[PDB]
C-alpha cells in the first residue's frame, strides 16, 4: 500500500532530469548542478555550465534572496539559471528567458566566482590552503594529523603523543595508548572527532562578543586554514580590522617535560588607527579517565573527579587541572595554561569557569550567556570543562600573542608517580617557553626535523605537486603510521591497539629512520614486535593467537633491516573472511628471506624447494591460485570451479591477494602470471581500480552494500600490494608485451591512490589531498576514510620500486620502470655512509633493461652489471641510465 | 613550586567570604548568593537577602549592563547589592552606600522579581510548571518520563516503549530492550540524553527563520513547560503574536500498530489581525542499530545504512525511514511522518533533507543555513538525520495543527518479519489518526488510564502537594519501574537488562494492577520472574529475552517468595500454587509453583549453607559494592560439585562467608511459604515449615548476634581465626578512629522485617543507628570501613562512601514502622516513628521545591541518593526508593494485608490530628478516617474506639468484604 524508495535507485538524478528538460533548449556545458524542488522528484532547479562537479545549488540555497526568488516558479514547474554575458537569466520550461533581479544577480555572480577552487588548493610545498566558508567533499578532506617526538626517550612507540585537527582547529588530542588529553566524542557523525569547545576561543570588546573561532559570521571577511607537515595555521580578518592567527602543533620532548603537551599560539594584530581593549576566553573539555563509563555510567564519570586550580610561586592563577579520586585515574594528570604576551609584559589569565552549564547559560556554545564575566567557581563534579579568561589592550599596529599549553604527565615515564610530578614538569615547560621567540623556534625545530627526515628519497620531477606529495606528505604519513598504526585519526577513535601486522609500516619508514641516525630506534621497534605469536599490543597483549597471518610478517622486517645495514648482530589478513593459500606465500617468502639472512650471518635453501612445490601442485587450481583451500568437508575457494560465486556471468571467486603474493614470494611461473593477469583484467580491474575480490555467495560456506569495504570495493592497501607484484613481474618476466601491460596497470592504479590528484574533481573523489585514505567506493569513486591505511606504506614502497631501487646482498638492484609518457626521471637517494644522484633518460614509449638496450654509468665508468654497490666513501655518486 | 587548589580543599566559599566582609556592616538575611571577582579568590561580589538559595549572581552577569557596572569596583575591591527602600544600592567595603544607576536598578528589580519560583512550581494536580529561561537545580530536575502501554499484548514486560523528555522536549525514545527509535547521546554531560535535533522544529516566514523550539530568543515572550503524568506540554508566545503548543506522549497499543510510536502535536494559533504564510521544518536523528560500533567504528555505523523515502497510494511523500544492509539490523524498521492540518484539509510535507551537513551548512543547529529550502536528497550513508518541511497559511484567529509520528516496527512482535510489515502497520496508524479529534481523544485515554490506575489508594489530607505527589506522581513512578526496572532514564542509558531483584517494584504496583482488573498481568509477571529459578532453588541474576548468570549473586532467588506471598494473601489465589512453569535448567521441563517455592527455601536452608546454619554469600548479595570472597562457586558449578561430594537434603562442602542479610531473607521466605501452605489447605507443609523457622531463627540469633548489632557477612573461611565477622562491635574492620566497627543499616532493617530481632535487640540497634548511621541528611548505608586490595572510587558523600542511599534507607523505615507497631516500649515506638517520618521528609519528591538549588533531585520523581556533604539529591530517577516509599506511606497509614484481612494499625505524625484516605479492594471499597489529639498515638499503647459501618469492633483486623459497597472505617484515639 505504501511505497519505499531507498537512496540506491535505478531512478533518474536531478542533473539527468535537468538534461531531459533543458538539454536541447539551453547550453548546459560539461558539468551542471541541480536539485529537486519537491519530494515527488518531478521537477528540478539547476545552474548550467560549471567548471567542475560541485554542490553549487546547495550553496545558492543558503542565500535567502535566491530561495525566495524561486518561490514564484518552483515547486510547480522546472527552472535553470544561465550565464549569457555577465548578467544571469532564469529559463522556464515554457520558453521564456527572464533576466533575474539585481539582488539575485548579485548572489549568482558571487556564488559562481571560484568554483574551480572551492575544495582549496595545494602550495608548492604540498600544504593545503582551505577556505572555512566552502563546503567539504567529505569528512576527512580538511583534516590534518599531528604527532609528537619521543626519539631517544623511554618507550618511544607507546609514549609519543598524537592529535587530529580539522580546518576550524576542532578535534582531540592523546598521550600514550588511548589516554585522552582533550575529550574525544563518540557520536553519530564522522565529522565530530572531539568535544566542540576543544581549542576554540572568543574575543570580547567592552561587553559584547565580537568573535568565535568556530563561527564564520558577517564580521569575518577572510578566513583561511593551511594544513602542513605537523602543524596547522588558521588565519582570520575581521571587518573591525583584526588579523587573528592560530597556530597548532605538538611540542617535541625535552628533558623534564610532561609526556604530552599541545601548543596553540594566537596572534592578534590591530590593523586599525585606534587602540582596542579586548579580552580572550579560551575553552576546552578534558578527556575522562573512565572512558568505558561514558556508555555504562555517565554519572560515575562525573562524580569521580573535580576541578582544581593551579598557582605559581607568586600566588598568581595560571590554569586548571581535573583531579580524580580513584587511584587508577590518578596515574595521569592533565592541565591547561595560558600566557598573554603584550610586547615585554607576560601575564596570566585573570578569570576562569569550569561548568559548561554556567558558561553557556541561556545561550549556546557559539554565543554563551556567561562568556564575558566568568564566575571563578571550581566544580566539585566533572566533566572537565574549562574556560580561561584574560583582558588585554592592543595598540594600533602592535600584536598581542596568547600561548596555551594543554597537556598531560604520567606514571608511564616517571617512577613513583603523583600529581607533584606533573607540577614539577609543568614548571619546566613554562620556564622553557618564558621568552616569546621560544615558540617560533620550537616550530622551526619541528619543520626542519621533517624536511630533513624526508631527504632519504627525493624526486626532482617536473610536477611540483607530485614531488612535495611524495617528498614531504607521504613521508610524514608513513612516519605517523609507524607510531600510531591504525589507532588514532578522525573517525578511528575506539580501542584499536598497535597491531602486529602493522609492522608493515616499518618496511617503508625503516630506511628513513636509519638515514637520520636512528638505526637504534629501528632496532628497538623490531624487538618490541619480536617480543610477542600475539595479534595485538600496547603495554600488554590483546586477542592472543587470533589471526593466522600475524607472525609471518616479522621476517620481512628483519630481512629488510638486515640487508640494508648488514647487521646480523640483532638475533588471516582479511578481517572479513570468516569460514590459507595467502599464508603459504608469506611463509614461503619468510623461509626464503631467512635463507638469505642466515648466509650473511643450505638448511633453508632445500626447504624452500619443498615448501614451494607443495603450493604450486595442490594450490594452483587451473586458472588462478586458490585463496582458502578447504580440506574439511566444496574443494576450495578462489579459482575456476570453486562453486561459490554470486554472479551469473563469472565462474568463481577471484582474490587479488592470491595473485599478488604468488608473485611477491617468487612462486608463480611466467606462464601462471600471464594467465592470472588476463583473469585480473576481466573481473578484478574496474574504472576505479583493482578490486579486492569478485562477487561471492559466502552464505553457502554480509555487512556492506556493494561498493563499500569488503563487498567489492577498491581496497587500496590490497591494490598497492597487487601493484608491488605487477612491478616485480614487469622487471623479471621474459615477455616484454606482458611487462608493458603490467606496468600499464601499476601506473593506472597509482594515479587513483596518489593523494594530490584528489583535488582534480574533488566533490566526486573526496578522500584527502595530502593523506592516503582506505578505499574507493566502486559505485561513486569516492575515497573513503580512515586516513590511516597501509595504502601509504605500499604506495611509498611502490613508487621507489618503480624508480628502480631494490636492496639486495651486493647492493642496489637498479631496474627502473618509467611511465611511457616520461622521458626524464631524476631523484636523490641517501645511504648510511654515502649518497646517490640518479638520473634516467629514455625516448617516449615503454622501456626496461630486460628488453631495451641501455648504457649505465656510475661516476663516469660504465658497468654492464645492473647491481650498484653500497658505497661507504661519504660522497655523492652520480648514476646515469640512457635507454636507446 | 606550583600549588594545586581543589574544589573540596578550597577553604572559604564566596558566601562565607561575603559574610566575613559584610556580615557586621549590612544585613544579609538568611540567604545570599555571591561570586569571586578574581582567580586568587580574595574578593567577592554578592547580593544580600534572597528568599532562598539561588544562583542570582550567575543570572545577573548575563545582563551586560550589570557586568560593566561592576567594572569600576571589581576586581580590585569587594561589593554587595542591597534593596533599601525600592531603589537598589551597591555597598563598598570602604563605607559608602552608592545608589546604582537607573538601567542597573531596572535589571536588579527584574532579576530579583520571583526568585522564590525560579525552579518552577507544582499545580494542585502535581504537574511541574517550568520556565524555559530559568536555570536548572540539576540534570534530572526538569526531566519527565513517558511510557507506552502493552497490557493484553504479547510480552508486555519486554516490548513496552519508553522515552525521556526534558523541558525543551529534548531526549531519546526507545522500543524493546535497548533498541533506539531516536538517537541516544553517549557524551560527557548528564544533561545530554539525546541528539540535540530530536523532537525540535523551526518556523519560517517569507524567507527568514522566526522560531526554534530549543532556542529562547528576543522574539519569545512567554515560554513555559508543564511536565505531567505521561505527557509533556510546552507552550510559547512570540512577539509577532503566535501561540505555539507542543504536546508529547507515547501512543498506547492498538491492533496492528507499530511496536513503538511517539506522537508530538504542534498547535500554532495566529493571534494577530492579519493572516500569515509560514512553513515548518521538523528535525530529528534516528538511533543506530549498531550501537556498539559508535565507539569501536563510527564509519561502520554510517556505511551499513542509507536513507529511504515513503510514499502513499496517491504518490505523495509522507516521510523518511533508515534502510539497513545487514540482516541483524533489518529486524527493526524505523519511521517518521508528518501531517499538516488546516481546518478541513489534511496534508503531508512537501520537502525533506537527510544530511546534517547539508541542512546546517555554514550555520549552526540553532540557525541552519539550508533550513528554508530543503534539497530532497536521500543520503546513501548514515547517520539517520532527517528534516521534514511543509508550508501552510494560518488565517487570523484560526489554528494550524501539525502531528508527527516517529516510531518503530519489529520482528519481536511479528512472525516472518520484513520492511513490508512496518509499511502495513504505519498505514494502520495513519488511518487511525486521520481525523484531527483522534489525537486529543487518545491523549484523554492516556490521562484517564492513570487517574483511574491511582484510585487504589488516595490520600485526602490537607496538603494538596503531598496528595497529588502520592496519588498521581508516585503511583506512576512505581508503574514506570515495574516495566523499565533501572534500564532507561536521563542518565541511565547503557545496557542494563531487567534485574531479578527489581521484582521488588512489583510488591507495590501489584495492588494497583489487580484493582484495575489486571490480576492476569500480575500473574504473567510473577511467572516470567519465576521461570528463571532452577530445579535446585538458586536462580538467574538478570534477563530480557533470555536469562543469564545462574546462582551468581546470592540474594536474587530469595526475593521471589515475597512477591508470591503478597499476591497470594491479597487475592487468596492458591490456584497459582499448582501451575507448571518453564525452568531455566534444561529441556522443556515444567515444575509446579508449589515445588518451585519449596526448592527455593530448601536451597538456602539445607543446601547452600555454612558453618553456623545461615545461607552462603557466593560472589555477592544485595550490595553491588561488597566484593570480598576468594573463589566463588556458580549455581551450576555447585550442581556439578554437589554431585561430586554425594558420590536433596545434605549441605554443600565449603567454608564460605555467610551473608547474614540473606539469612533474614530466607527466614522470611520460609515463614512466608509457611503461611502460603496453610491457606493452600495443607496441615503437613505448614507443619513442615512451622518447625523449620524455629530452627532457622535460632541459628541466626545465637551465632549472628555479635553483642551490639547483627553481623552482615559472617566470615568462616580463615583457618587461624583472625576475622570472625563483618558488621558489629569487634569485627576489626573500621576506618574511623572514633567508631568501633562497621555497622550496616540493612542488618538492622532485615532483622526486624523477618521478625528475628527481639525488642531488647531492636532498642540496642536503634541507639547504634542514631550514633553513627543517622545524619542530618538521613540514614546512611554503612559506617566508614577499611575492607582491605581494592580502595575507593567515590569521594566521601557520593554513592557507597557514606551516602544516604534512599532505597536502603526506605527499607530501614519499613523496619522502623513495623517495630513501632509491635514493640512493648511506647517511648521506643515513638522514637522509631520520629526517625521514619524524618527520613520520609528527605525522600518525598515534592519537598525538593523547598530550597531546590541546594536539594536538586526532581520534584515529581524519586532519585537515588543524597550526598552527605551538600544534601544534593543525585540521580538516577529510577530507584527502589519510590517502591518502598510507597509501601512505607501506606503502612504508616495503617494498612497491612494478613490472612484474615487488613491489619489496621496507623502511626500518624505527632503534628497531625486528622488523616483520611480511600482504599479499594477487588470486590469492595473502604473509607478510612482517623482522628487523634496532638502527640504520639498507637493502638498498642493509647486507648481508642474503632468503628466499621457504625458498629464498634474490638478486633483490630478488618475483613476483606465482597459486597461491592464503600465501607466507612473510623478510628478515634482518646
Ligand atoms: O582486512 C583488511 C584490513 O581491514 C582493516 O580492517 C577492518 C575491515 O576492513 C572492516 O570490514 C571491519 O569492520 C568491523 C567493524 O569495525 C565492527 O564494528 C563490526 O561489528 C558488528 C558485528 O560484525 C556484528 O556481528 C554485531 O552485531 O554488530 C557489530 C557492531 O555493533 O564488524 C565489522 C566486521 O565484521 O573492521 C576492520 C578493523 O577492525 C584493518 O585495519 C587492516 O589491518 C586489515 O588488513
Ligand atoms: O548497592 C546499592 C545499589 O547499587 C545500585 O548500584 C550501582 C552502585 O551504586 C554504583 O556504586 C556502581 O558503580 C559502578 C559503575 O557504574 C561502573 O561504571 C564502574 O566501573 C569501573 C570499574 O570499577 C573499573 O574496575 C574499571 O577499570 O573501570 C570501570 C569504568 O570504566 O564501577 C562502579 C563500581 O565500582 O554501579 C552500580 C550499578 O551497577 C544498584 O542499581 C542497586 O541494585 C543496588 O541495590
Residue numbers in the entry:
A (entry chain A): 1 to 532, 539 to 577, 621 to 628, 664 to 685, 692 to 723, 728 to 795, 802 to 984
B (entry chain B): 1 to 647, 653 to 793, 799 to 984
From the study:
The crystal structure of CDP from Ruminiclostridium thermocellum reported herein is the first solved for cellodextrin phosphorylase enzymes.
The glucan was oriented such that the non-reducing terminal glycosidic bond was located between the phosphate and Asp624, the expected general acid catalyst. Thus, the glucan spanned subsites −1 to +3 of the active site pocket. In the more open CDP pocket, two side-chains from this “opposing loop” contribute to the acceptor binding site: Asp297 hydrogen bonds to O3 of the +2 subsite sugar, and Tyr300 forms a stacking interaction with it. There are no large conformational changes between the apo and ligand bound CDP structures (rms deviation of 0.692 Å for a dimer on dimer superposition), although a number of side-chains become reoriented to engage with the substrates. In particular, the carboxylate of the catalytic Asp624 is flipped about the Cα-Cβ bond, to hydrogen bond with O3 of the −1 subsite sugar and the oxygen of the scissile glycosidic linkage; additionally, the adjacent residue within this “catalytic loop”, Cys625, also hydrogen bonds to O2 of the +1 subsite sugar. Concurrently, the general acid donates a proton to the glycosidic oxygen to cleave the bond and release the shortened cellodextrin molecule.
